[PDB]
């Protein structure tokens, strides 16, 4: 109940390939067809992915910035809290951004910090002032 | 096996069951209890494992007795029918042997046979030997018939029959015995060279060999599996089939390919899109980092929103890079599972030009098998007679087949230029009439109790007819010739004065350039003892090339074996012979095949004897007076000598129990 290894036969082919006197020769054109279609079309996004490929040329080193590394600190400068209030601002809940902007901060002093100050610095309404955006 | 058993498988029996035909005349002791049967086989067994150890001289109902020891020695009568019977149904005691018993004085009933051809010949014999009168008449001016011989000087070539199919269980195998036969094992390798002259590769030789093994098992699948058998109302052929299979293995390559190069432009697009996220990216990049530059222009101290400004613009520019150096590393496995799918691409084709001619090749050599065109054979039925094929090697018959029927004969009444033309069967009895080869007018009237016809059936199909039947046969009959096929293949015979070729290697192939043309000249043997090339035309081109002269004909074999063996190793044969067997008009073809439409019935249909109405009305049934044997007949054997002769005893067994009575089935 299995054919030899490697021959292919299913019952709809069978009957696909009979029916008409040269239904075989029509499958086997429509194929060779579909085939150098699909190759044709290969070349297309080739050469469009290519011209695409030089624009990229360059990458993006010049415009590398250097690594800044701040040890996280617990104290917070004037500075650094006028800084915070400005990226919620500008970031909202996007929490890694606003540590990655103060420069060293960790995320958590960050989201203590909505709490412990949210009272003077309405962090309330700077929030849905950002979400008006 | 060897043993008892081993007599009974040699004897195409089954060594521990009885066969329908043994039950029909000892329905006591089938029927019987499980005891007495095993007594019966036995004594069957070993009746005719004596006939066996010894075929050259009769086995007599005492003999056998001797050598039984109880308790199956015990019942005489037993063992009197069981002897009386294998006796009869040539069994035992056939071919030819020493008669211990000189024959009964006077002869009971009277049989023409028609044909010489080894069926007619096993028949005659075994009937004589039951003690009937018995003559046969044959068109040619010799025995044998499709067993045909080439001699001069010492250059002999089978033009007919050349080729025993193994031992194991071939009633043959005893005929051996009684007639010298030089039996030659044939060495099964056999190197095949395109169209040029050049041996093809081992490595493809192989690949398309197994190919064509696989296509085959492909169409059985079809047949038994998906039932593949009708087309339009016309029942199917293996031409059909195989070209069926072959287009949908074409098919599935190309099937592949689509899916594989599909699966490239997939990636390819996601390779696109990719970019155009990418070049996006670099351009918000772009403007981002002049933003940072500006902001931070901005020469400190500073307030702390350009502080900030420049921060943040810092950050975000990092968040971009970061994204951009994660779609690269994304880029990169893309580049390389295109590096992957480019390098290893499903197979461009399903057979070469060189693939397909060299796969024609064992195609020819399957319409060389069966002498016909695998557009004939049916799908469901050309294999039929495949479960009892003997065991052992095939062998040649050194010395020229003919041999066996010219020995067959000694002792025989046979009117050699004798034609039947017109069969007349009533309930009285029968009468035929032939005529003189030589001069036609010369007229013969026979008259006998029974004819037996071993015509060919290429004869019984000639239209208009070559023999009458008066009345004429049966719709039953007719039909069934119609729906045999019966094929056709020729030899060219090679006489050298000297072996130009590898003596080491018995046959060899030439692959022809077409499909059409692949059966013209595509095998060559070297059998024989002298320098001998023997070149086979079969499939389509046998029937055409019939119509080409020989010299023709042994121009396009010198051209071959040129390019073969090298341009000057090849000299002028000294004596050609080409066969045409369906020109010959005693034979209208080489054997029968199963044609597609037609079933392993008809060759029993074909077997079938014919019973005449009867004369005046009202009167009793009569004896049927007809019978019909040769390589047509037998259903389990058919175009073979063994078949021809198969039948031939048989259908003696069935006249005697006719005419003679058998007093073995109480
Ligand atoms: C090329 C070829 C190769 C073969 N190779 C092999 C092989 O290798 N191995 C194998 O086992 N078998 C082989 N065979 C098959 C074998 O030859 C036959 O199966 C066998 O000889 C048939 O015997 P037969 O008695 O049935 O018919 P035939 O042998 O044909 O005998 C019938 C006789 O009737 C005669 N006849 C015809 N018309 C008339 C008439 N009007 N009046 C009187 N007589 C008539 C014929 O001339 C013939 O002698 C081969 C056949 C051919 C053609
Ligand atoms: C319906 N069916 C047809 C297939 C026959 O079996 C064959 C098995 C092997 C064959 O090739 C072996 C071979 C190798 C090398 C040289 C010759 C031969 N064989 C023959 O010439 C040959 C042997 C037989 S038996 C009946 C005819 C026939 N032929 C023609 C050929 C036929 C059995 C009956």
Known sequence: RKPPKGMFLSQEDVEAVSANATAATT?????????????????????????????????????????????????????????????????????????????????????????????????????????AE | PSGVEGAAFQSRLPHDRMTSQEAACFPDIISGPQQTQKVFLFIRNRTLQLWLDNPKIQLTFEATLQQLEAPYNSDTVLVHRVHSYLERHGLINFGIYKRIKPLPTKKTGKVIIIGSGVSGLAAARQLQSFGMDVTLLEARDRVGGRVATFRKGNYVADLGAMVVTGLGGNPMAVVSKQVNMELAKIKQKCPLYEANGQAVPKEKDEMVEQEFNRLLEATSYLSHQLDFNVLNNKPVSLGQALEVVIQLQEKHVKDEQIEHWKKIVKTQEELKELLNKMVNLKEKIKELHQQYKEASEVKPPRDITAEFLVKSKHRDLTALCKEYDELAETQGKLEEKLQELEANPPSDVYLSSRDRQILDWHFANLEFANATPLSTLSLKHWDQDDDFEFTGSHLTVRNGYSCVPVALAEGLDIKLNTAVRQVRYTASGCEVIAVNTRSTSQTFIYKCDAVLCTLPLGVLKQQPPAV?????????????????????????????????????????????????????????????????????????????????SDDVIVGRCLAILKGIFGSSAVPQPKETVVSRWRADPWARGSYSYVAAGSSGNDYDLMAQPITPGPSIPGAPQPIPRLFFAGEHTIRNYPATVHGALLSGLREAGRIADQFLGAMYTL
Not at chain 1, 43 to 67: C, F, H, M, V
Not at chain 1, 73 to 99: C, M, P
Not at chain 1, 109 to 116: D, G, H, L, M
Not at chain 2, 511 to 534: C, D, M
């Open chain 1, 27 to 131: 499958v086997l054109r429509q194929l060779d067809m579909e085939l150098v279609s699909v190759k044709r079309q290969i070349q297309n996004i080739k050469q469009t992915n290519s011209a695409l490929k030089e624009k990229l040329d360059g990458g993006i080193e010049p415009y590398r910035l250097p690594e800044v590394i701040q040890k996280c600190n617990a104290r917070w400068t004037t500075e650094e809290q006028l800084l915070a209030v400005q990226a919620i601002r500008k970031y909202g809940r996007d929490f890694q951004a606003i540590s990655d902007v103060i420069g060293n901060k960790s995320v958590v002093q960050v989201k203590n910090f909505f709490v412990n100050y949210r009272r003077r610095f309405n962090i309330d309404e700077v929030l849905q002032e950002w979400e």
């Open chain 2, 468 to 548: 009458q039947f008066v009345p004429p046969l049966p719709e039953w009959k007719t039909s069934a010739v119609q729906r045999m096929g019966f094929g056709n293949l020729n030899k060219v015979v090679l006489c050298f004065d000297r072996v130009f070729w590898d003596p080491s290697v018995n046959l060899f192939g030439h692959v022809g350039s077409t499909t059409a043309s692949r059966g013209e000249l595509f095998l060559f043997w070297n059998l024989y003892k002298a320098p001998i090339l023997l070149a086979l035309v079969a499939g389509e081109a046998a029937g055409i090339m019939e119509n080409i």
